[PDB]
Design a protein around this ligand. Structure first.
Ligand code: MG
Ligand code: MG
Ligand code: MG
Ligand code: MG
Lengths: 518, 767
């Protein structure tokens, strides 16, 4: 057979740090986009999908070097290489107790009218946060020891730097490894070959390998925005309720439900303002374009990403698609409720009756409604008929406004390595993209970007208290970004740095080329 | 007596380059159309795991004492030879069959074409561009994977040497138990999680491995190989008339490869079993009663070819004097067949000569074309892995195909023995024809996936008795005739054949002179074949094909039917003992004029272990049936109105699409029947508000129809109106699956109807 100096079984627990979606073939009558299930109908991570996530990250680590990647993950082309030395099994996903697959609604908002675009309504099934699955790796070493790149991979998993499945830029897919265990079988020797058959192998201390390497995280800029709602902030739930028509969206996070603003929603508001800035500068109208063409404008194609779209642009055939270098996480409330405590709110039927006990429960003031209604407050609204006054027949509706829910800081992750690859390495070309991003954040802090439902109707305006910029391995001319900002107008960034960015930005405004066009 | 049992622990893929429908790659499926593991996959995988074990015991030496043991058990790999090897290659001791699903489960599938598809599902796959992070052009595939939890079992045979010491038997068992336990994966995409398995031998456990662990340091070289030489006695009686004819019926229990020729990388197959393949079974069964090897040398024994059974008898190779209408006739059409030994070509219409296949019986007033038999055959494609790259490569050939006769075909041979040899046997065993029942392996690749056949003996048949017509003598070659020229090479000619019969029968023959009637219709044949005892190919045998015909006018003398009978028994020419030379005189199918004629599951028991696996397959077949039927029912506006009361009236929708959407959002919460409180609660609150109830006026009772569909548990199944009998295999499966899938069927049908409504509403709108 293939000679193997040692077989390493490398195993542990992977946990979903944000909701996952690994897609099947798609569609399931319940949702438009449907989770992969194994032949027993259990949700699982295909080893193809996990193996590609790992091979992908190593390729970004080894600077897209083929030569070393093929020596781990194998090849078909080279006469010397063939089959993969790393083996990745299928792993079933165990969803937390009582928890279940969630459906996330999605909409595309027409950039001209500001309203849902026709046809752009979809829904996605997602594995809730905190679900677990087994890490199922085997490695057949032909040399002695363990490859350092394979050690860096396991360090990256423990750091949670790998994302798996769909919608990776829009909230989903982060996984982190726990309980890593390493079993070595010295298959080259009789004592080792019988160990494989009987003794269940030789333990290695991971901490001893983890001590012999420095984990080289790739360039990124983390942005943490600390904020609180100035007007109630919510994303609307999937459908009308009983006592309350409009209820906030919530998600399972382990034992408790929390209110959630999806990263899809925070990404979408940021993208919209970024585009409006670019189109404003160019005075480029958006009104004659359909929604898929409205989205497709300069710099945002690299930051927020573009749809795959093959084009025979010049007899040469090219793909316009690229992933977003900017990714956004789901933002959850600090407040939490047991799953049944919220089911009592969803199923209240009298706004002054059995709803009042339910909100007193969930808000954590089970005996004090006047404090309960400082957290979640039911509102009633009428449409008033313009000739008669009073109220228009049928037009009475109510909202459960999360007036006082406190929210955790928003995490935006900017992949500087991915942009720099788009610009074929030229870090000069980052400054227009970094300049745009800082202008978007300036508006966020100036209440120019409201979030969630009903922004024009008494909701959605946020106060930003602090933006923390925390990049790793940034190029030296972007190193001034590492800052905590509290002035909305960026005055905490060095004026020489803000003036440098302004210069590269103004030089792009004077000629707004496709900046990744080499 | 040994089996391998395989428990598949993840979804698994095997065997085929072809792809059928919207799937790109499809799994290997057996004769029941059910997925299975081919015996060559199983051997190759198990060998590979035993190779890892031996490679460890040799301390990584790629050649050594323990790789000798692998070559002992699994046979040598010629075509891995790196230098001069003087001994002939050893065959394997271990034969491993194909692994099939549980036979009682396989019976439940019979005819249920929709269920046979549901054993697998599409797995998507995409390849992603590393710099952009988006799917590469071309790099999309959808792949068939069989559901995990399949438990499959294979027959195994260890035909150990007649002398192996008990220490060595324990080593063999030790290695096989060790290699089985080291085996963890098989099939395609192993390295990516497909095809995880448990492979276990019957009667080998950790005790077999533990003995090896305790003793491997003591182990010697394997015993040397030795051929099973023949042994003669010379003691047979002289051959004396009569000749007994014992029909042997062969039935294929697995595909049989009978090499006709290799073209490129595909081995082509015969559509009959040559008699030489049965001499090994004749040696096995009768060589204890008389000297079978002397009987062959004396010609006291004939085993004919096995040809497809028609009319309860051996099918006879189609005579080349038959010609079919080229446009739309011949035996495949069942009309427009002319016997050109007796009929002129009709005016105008051109004919094609018959070229193959077999005909059943025919009688001198048949009034019908003779029954024509066909042999089914299948192409099996294999690969050879180069062990270091673990993929096939040019240095090891890597792709090849066998045509094979598929399973369930039935063939009839005849063993002929002179009376003196039946006396020899019957003096020793009165029941000797009972010993002719056997299961044996014949062909190419006989030791694994291919070649398993049943043999059954019939009762002694009557000797053929041809008509002694003194006007014409006509000869049908029922088998290939090999003649030697007067130089003892095979370059004989049809004039040598005239002299052979002329001399053999004591008659003079001349070609019939009728200008419209063909007298001779031969084709040349060449047989290239190995001989296993020699270890070298046979001398090339040249002759004329079966089906060849010729007819002679008898010039002088008289032909004797006694001698025609004897030649019809013993045949003519070389190697008649293998059934060459078998011939038919004056058969009326050559004599007749033909142009006017025309041709003539049960459920799994409730306690059954696989009942849990069958339930996974059924739900898949039910879900797709419900989805398909829901699509059809939404397509017609009368049915959406029947089922939910919804309708289109001009440009208007009843109710508004918003009202349908509101209902639908609630029905999303109908996960179980005990959630029907949720949906009925919505409807009562709707029904209580006057302005909202009237939104659904001008529907056909829509609110009651929804109330019924949700609260009457029988009603969804009556609207879907699916015959679930072809979709279920578990006993009590129908009532169980109905209760389980109820809420999903309601959600699916309502989802389909509202979609179909909206996209017809768009048409009325856009007028
Ligand atoms: Mg869909
Ligand atoms: Mg109400
Ligand atoms: Mg293509
Ligand atoms: Mg395809």
């Amino acid at each position: 057979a293939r000679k193997v100096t040692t077989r390493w079984k490398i195993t542990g627990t992977l946990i979903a740090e944000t909701p996952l979606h690994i897609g099947g073939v798609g569609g399931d009558a319940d949702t438009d986009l449907a989770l992969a299930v194994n032949g027993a109908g259990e949700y699982y991570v295909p080893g193809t999908s996990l193996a590609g996530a790992l091979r992908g990250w190593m390729t970004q680590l080894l600077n897209n070097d083929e030569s070393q990647i093929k020596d781990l993950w194998g090849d078909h082309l080279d006469a010397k290489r063939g089959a993969s030395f790393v083996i990745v099994d299928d792993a079933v996903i165990h969803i937390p107790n009582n928890a279940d697959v969630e459906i996330r609604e999605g909409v595309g908002i027409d950039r001209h009218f500001g309203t849902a675009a026709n046809g752009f309504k979809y829904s996605r099934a997602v594995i809730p946060k905190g679900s677990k699955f087994k890490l199922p790796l085997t490695f057949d070493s032909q040399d002695d020891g363990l490859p350092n790149a394979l050690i860096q991979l396991l360090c990256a998993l423990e750091a949670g730097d790998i994302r798996l499945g769909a919608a990776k830029t829009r909230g989903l897919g982060r996984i982190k490894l726990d309980d890593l265990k390493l079993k070595s079988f010295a298959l080259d020797k009789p004592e080792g070959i019988f160990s494989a058959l009987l003794d269940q192998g030789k333990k290695l201390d991971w901490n001893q390998l983890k001590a012999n390497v420095t984990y080289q995280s790739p360039p990124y800029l983390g942005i943490s925005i600390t904020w609180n709602p100035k007007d109630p902030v919510m994303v609307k739930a999937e459908g009308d309720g009983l006592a309350i028509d409009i209820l906030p969206l919530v998600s399972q996070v382990g034992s408790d439900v929390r209110f959630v603003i999806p990263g899809s929603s925070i990404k979408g508001i940021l993208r919209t303002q970024a585009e409006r800035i670019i189109r404003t500068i160019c005075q480029s109208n958006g009104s004659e374009k359909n929604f898929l063409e409205q989205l497709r404008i300069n710099l945002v194609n690299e930051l927020f990403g573009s749809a795959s779209l093959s084009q025979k642009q010049n007899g040469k055939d090219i793909d316009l698609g690229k992933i977003g270098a900017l990714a956004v996480n789901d933002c959850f409330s600090s407040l939490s409720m047991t799953p049944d405590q919220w089911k009592a709110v969803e199923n209240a039927t009298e706004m002054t009756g059995n709803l009042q006990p339910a909100l007193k429960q969930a808000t954590g003031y089970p005996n004090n409604i006047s404090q309960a209604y400082k957290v979640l407050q039911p509102a009633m609204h009428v449409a008033v008929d313009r000739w008669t006054g009073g109220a228009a027949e049928g037009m009475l509706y109510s909202v459960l406004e999360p007036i006082g829910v406190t929210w955790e800081p928003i995490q935006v992750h900017l992949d500087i390595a991915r942009l720099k690859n788009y610009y074929h390495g030229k870090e000069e070309k980052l400054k227009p993209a970094i300049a745009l991003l800082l202008l978007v954040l300036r508006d966020l802090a100036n209440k120019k970007i409201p979030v969630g439902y009903g922004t024009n109707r008494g909701m959605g305006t946020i106060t930003v208290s602090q933006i923390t910029l925390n990049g790793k391995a940034l190029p030296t001319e972007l190193e001034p970004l590492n800052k905590t900002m509290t002035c909305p107008n960026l005055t905490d960034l060095d004026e020489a740095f803000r003036q440098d960015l302004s210069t590269a930005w103004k030089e792009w405004i004077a000629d707004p080329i496709d900046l990744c066009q080499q | 007596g040994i089996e391998i049992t395989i428990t598949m622990q993840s979804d698994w893929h095997v065997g085929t380059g072809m792809g059928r429908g919207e799937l790109d790659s499809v799994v290997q499926r057996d004769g029941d159309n059910l997925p299975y593991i081919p015996g060559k996959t199983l051997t190759g995988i198990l060998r590979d795991s035993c190779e890892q074990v031996a490679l460890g015991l040799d301390n990584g030496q790629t050649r050594g004492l323990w790789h000798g043991w692998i070559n002992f058990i699994f046979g040598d790999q010629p075509a891995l030879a790196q230098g001069a090897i003087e001994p002939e290659p050893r065959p394997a001791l271990i034969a491993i069959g194909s692994a099939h699903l549980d036979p009682k489960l396989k019976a439940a599938f019979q005819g249920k074409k929709q269920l046979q598809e549901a054993i697998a599902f599409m797995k998507p796959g995409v390849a992603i561009d590393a710099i952009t992070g988006t799917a590469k052009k071309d790099f999309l595939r959808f792949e068939e994977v069989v559901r995990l939890g399949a438990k499959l079992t294979a027959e195994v045979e260890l035909n150990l040497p007649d002398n192996l010491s008990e220490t060595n038997k324990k080593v063999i068992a030790g290695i096989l138990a060790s290699g089985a336990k080291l085996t963890e994966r098989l099939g395609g995409k192993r390295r990516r999680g497909n095809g995880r398995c448990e492979l276990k031998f019957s009667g080998y456990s950790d005790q077999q491995i533990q003995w090896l662990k305790d003793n491997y340091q003591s182990v010697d070289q394997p015993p040397k190989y030795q051929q099973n030489k023949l042994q003669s006695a010379g003691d047979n009686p002289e051959q004396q008339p009569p000749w007994h004819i014992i029909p042997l019926t062969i039935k294929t229990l697995s595909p049989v490869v009978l090499p006709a020729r290799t073209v490129g990388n595909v081995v082509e197959c015969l559509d009959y079993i040559p008699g030489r393949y049965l001499l090994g079974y004749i040696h096995k069964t009768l060589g204890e009663y008389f000297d079978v090897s002397q009987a062959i040398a004396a010609g006291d024994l004939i085993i004919t070819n096995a040809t497809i059974k028609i009319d309860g008898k051996a099918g006879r190779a189609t005579p080349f004097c038959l010609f079919g209408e080229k446009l739309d006739g011949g035996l495949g059409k069942g009309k427009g067949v002319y016997n050109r030994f007796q009929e002129s070509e009709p005016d105008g219409i051109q004919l094609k000569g018959e070229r193959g296949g077999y005909v059943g019986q025919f009688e001198q007033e048949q009034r019908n074309l003779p029954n024509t038999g066909k042999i089914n055959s299948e192409l099996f494609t294999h690969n050879t892995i180069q062990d270091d790259v673990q993929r096939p490569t040019s240095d090891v050939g890597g792709v090849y195909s066998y045509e094979a006769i598929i399973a369930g075909q039935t063939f009839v041979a005849e063993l002929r023995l002179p009376d003196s040899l039946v006396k020899q046997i019957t003096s020793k065993n009165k029941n000797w024809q009972a010993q002719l029942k056997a299961t044996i392996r014949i062909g190419q690749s006989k030791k694994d996936q291919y070649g398993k056949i049943e043999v059954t003996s019939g009762n002694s048949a009557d000797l053929p008795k041809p008509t002694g017509n003194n006007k014409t003598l006509s000869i049908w070659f029922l088998s290939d005739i090999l003649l030697r020229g007067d130089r003892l090479n095979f370059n004989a000619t049809p004039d040598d054949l005239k002299k052979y019969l002329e001399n053999a029968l004591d008659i003079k023959l001349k070609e019939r002179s009728d200008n419209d009637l063909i007298c001779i219709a031969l084709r040349s044949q060449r047989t290239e074949s190995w001989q296993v005892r020699w270890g070298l190919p046979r001398p090339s045998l040249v002759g004329w094909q079966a089906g060849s015909c010729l007819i002679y006018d008898i010039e002088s003398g008289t032909v004797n039917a006694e001698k025609l009978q004897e030649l019809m028994i013993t045949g003519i020419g070389d190697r008649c003992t293998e059934g060459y030379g078998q011939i038919g005189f004056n058969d009326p199918l050559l004599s007749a004029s033909l142009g006017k004629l025309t041709a003539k599951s049960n459920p799994l028991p409730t306690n059954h272990p696989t009942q849990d696996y069958a339930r996974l397959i059924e739900k898949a077949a039910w879900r797709e049936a419900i989805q398909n039927k829901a699509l059809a029912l939404a397509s017609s506006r009368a049915k959406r109105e029947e089922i939910l009361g919804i309708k289109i009236m001009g440009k208007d929708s009843q109710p508004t699409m918003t009202q349908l959407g509101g209902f639908r959002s609630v029905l999303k919460r109908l996960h179980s029947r005990n959630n029907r409180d949720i949906v009925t609660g919505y409807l009562t609150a709707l029904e209580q508000v006057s302005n909202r109830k009237e939104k659904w006026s001008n529907t056909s009772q829509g609110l009651t129809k929804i109330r019924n569909l949700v609260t009457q548990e029988n009603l969804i199944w009556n609207h879907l109106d699916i015959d679930f009998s072809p979709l279920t295999i578990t006993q009590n499966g129908v009532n169980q699956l109905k209760s389980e899938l109820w809420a999903e069927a309601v959600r699916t049908l309502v989802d389909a109807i509202i979609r179909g409504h909206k996209r017809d509403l768009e048409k009325a709108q856009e007028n």
